[PDB]
Design a protein around this nucleic acid. Sequence first.
DNA 1: CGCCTCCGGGAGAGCT
DNA 2: AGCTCTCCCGGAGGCG
Lengths: 72, 73
Amino acid sequence: KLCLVCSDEASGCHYGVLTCGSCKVFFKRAVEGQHNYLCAGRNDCIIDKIRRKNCPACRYRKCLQAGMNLEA
Amino acid sequence: PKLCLVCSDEASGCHYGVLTCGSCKVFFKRAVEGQHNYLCAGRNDCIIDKIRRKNCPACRYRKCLQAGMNLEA
DNA sequence: CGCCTCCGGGAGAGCT
DNA sequence: AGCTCTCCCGGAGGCG
Ligand SMILES: [Zn+2]
Ligand SMILES: [Zn+2]
Ligand SMILES: [Zn+2]
Ligand SMILES: [Zn+2]
């Protein structure tokens, strides 16, 4: 019942991966159109409920790493 | 207490443009997509309510259409 | 028919 | 503005 991107409470399988609603819509938005997203740390930011908003680059990386994809 | 505009049963929200109950939503989608041709056994003016709605899909469909229901809404 | 679960996705409200 | 994230409602696939 835990999101594989941020460990918040998961709402189901979204875009192929067990995720929360937050990460589901974050990903849909990130994966379409152009976004810079630059990490301010060392591309290993902590992405949990409290901090996931801080680094969209690291959050997006984790989405991809977990296997999220539009085709699913 | 929100009432389906087609059959007066308890509405479940705004479906296809119109405040309807779940059964009317489901019925409407099926009616439009099976291109169903229904025939009224009366005078094209049946009472459509929770029990009677089953009797006359012709009149139920007509009412759905007259209320503004549309799949693209 | 009337209902169910599951998931995509728009609206919009509220941040920053 | 851009972004976040929950309220609704859509289809698909299924069941009694
Ligand atoms: Zn998450
Ligand atoms: Zn980062
Ligand atoms: Zn109804
Ligand atoms: Zn009739």
